Amino acid sequence: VNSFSGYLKLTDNVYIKNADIVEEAKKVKPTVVVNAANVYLKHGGGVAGALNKATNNAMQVESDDYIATNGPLKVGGSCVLSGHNLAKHCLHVVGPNVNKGEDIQLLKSAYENFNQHEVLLAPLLSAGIFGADPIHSLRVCVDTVRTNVYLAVFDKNLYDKLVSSFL
Numbered sequence: 001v002n003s004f005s006g007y008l009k010l011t012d013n014v015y016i017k018n019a020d021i022v023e024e025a026k027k028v029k030p031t032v033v034v035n036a037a038n039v040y041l042k043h044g045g046g047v048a049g050a051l052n053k054a055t056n057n058a059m060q061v062e063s064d065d066y067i068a069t070n071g072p073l074k075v076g077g078s079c080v081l082s083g084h085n086l087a088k089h090c091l092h093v094v095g096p097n098v099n100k101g102e103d104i105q106l107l108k109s110a111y112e113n114f115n116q117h118e119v120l121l122a123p124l125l126s127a128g129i130f131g132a133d134p135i136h137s138l139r140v141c142v143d144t145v146r147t148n149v150y151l152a153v154f155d156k157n158l159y160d161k162l163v164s165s166f167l
């Protein structure tokens, strides 16, 4: 039993809610919140910008130190950093950005990072301003992640579209 509430059950381990992932993190304070990052951990917009703004830019400061030490992530890769005021940890996961011309087959590799954590709050990777089809992202999620994932979808109309088309 965990403190996630109001989520619609999609499968054995995947649950979904029409919610702001930032507001859900502040309420639940989960062990792991997933950020939809880029390889440089530049959290300017989208989920990343929203999470980072909610940390008062502390996420960006920590991320810049991480990159200065380790260099960029791989597309499909991840790193664990602090969750600041939002969660114990933030798992920064790089899904392919179709608008940048990156390989969509890397979406499965990106979701595999979730399997290293028992319970996560997460967005649909590569969706939104990353340019992939969210119906596809949800399918890859359900077919790849085996741990317990609580998906937050900001767009009300997309949430309804995702539920009603889910096989």
Ligand SMILES: CNc1ccc(NS(=O)(=O)c2cc3cccc(C)c3s2)cn1
Pocket (backbone or CB within 6 Å): 036, 045, 046, 047, 048, 123, 124, 125, 126, 127, 128, 129, 130, 134, 152, 153, 154, 155, 158
């Ligand atoms: C197509 N139009 C549209 C509008 C709103 C949303 N919302 S969302 O699924 O929470 C969401 C936003 C976002 C922003 C950056 C990166 C990611 C991975 C995500 S994922 C989705 N799609």
